[PDB]
Design a protein around this ligand. Structure first.
Ligand code: VO4
Ligand SMILES: [Ca+2]
Length: 104
């Protein structure tokens, strides 16, 4: 079973934990990877009920389970805050333009 499912992608809590740890360390190092510079700030304009406070940052989580290192970031993302607290898992899948929907 999947702890989070984004579209057709299934993630376990260990997949989320692994991806967040890598995104958080680049954020502490003031480093980014990929053409779209991840991790980068996330603005909650869609109003997702996250129980952890802002600011928020997004980093790609890959269906392969590999940690993102550059190349195509896919559609899904882990969102974490300044305190390295997980806020949610969201995706561009099934959302228009560059809007997001939450993974379930
Ligand atoms: O870098 V994205 O916000 O377009 O997921
Ligand atoms: Ca996995």
């Amino acid at each position: 079973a999947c702890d989070y499912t984004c579209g057709s992608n299934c993630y376990s809590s260990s997949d989320v934990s692994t991806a967040q740890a890598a995104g958080y360390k680049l954020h502490e190092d003031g480093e980014t990877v990929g053409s779209n510079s991840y991790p980068h700030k996330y603005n909650n304009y869609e109003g997702f009920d996250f129980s952890v406070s802002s600011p928020y940052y997004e980093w790609p989580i890959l269906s392969s389970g590999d940690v993102y290192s550059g190349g195509s970031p896919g559609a899904d993302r882990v969102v974490f805050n300044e305190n390295n607290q997980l806020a949610g898992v969201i995706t561009h899948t099934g959302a228009s333009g560059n809007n997001f929907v939450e993974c379930t």
